[PDB]
Design a protein around this ligand. Sequence first.
Ligand SMILES: Cc1ccc([C@@H]2C[C@@H](C)CCN2C(=O)c2ncnc3[nH]ccc23)o1
Length: 167
Amino acid sequence: VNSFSGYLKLTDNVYIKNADIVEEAKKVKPTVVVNAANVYLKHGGGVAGALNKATNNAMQVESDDYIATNGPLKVGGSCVLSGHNLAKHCLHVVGPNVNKGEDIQLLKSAYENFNQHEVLLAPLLSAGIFGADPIHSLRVCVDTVRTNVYLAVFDKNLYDKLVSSFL
Ligand SMILES: Cc1ccc([C@@H]2C[C@@H](C)CCN2C(=O)c2ncnc3[nH]ccc23)o1
């Protein structure tokens, strides 16, 4: 039993809710919140900008030190950093950004990072300002992630479409 509330169950291990991931993280304090990161960990907008704003920019400060030491992530890759006031840990995962021309096949590699964590609160990777079809992202999630994932979808209209079209 865990504290996630109000989710629709899609499969054995994937759950979905119309929610603001920032507000959901603030209430649940999950072990892991996933950030929709880029390779530079520049948290300017979308989910990343919102998560970073909620940490009062502490996420960005920590991320800049990470990059200065380690260099950029790979598209499809991830790193574990602090969850600050939102979660124990933040798993920064880089899905391909279609608006930069990155290969959508890398979306499966991106979701594979979730399998290193037993339970996660997450957005749909490569959705929103990353330009991919969220219906496709949900399909890849379900077919790739084997651990327990709680997906927060900010847009109510999109949430209803994802549910109604789910196979
Ligand atoms: C066109 C459009 C607008 C928004 C989005 C994306 C994808 C859709 C499918 C879900 C919501 N989205 C997020 O990025 C998101 N999700 C959860 N919590 C968030 N908090 C701040 C942003 C945010 O796409």
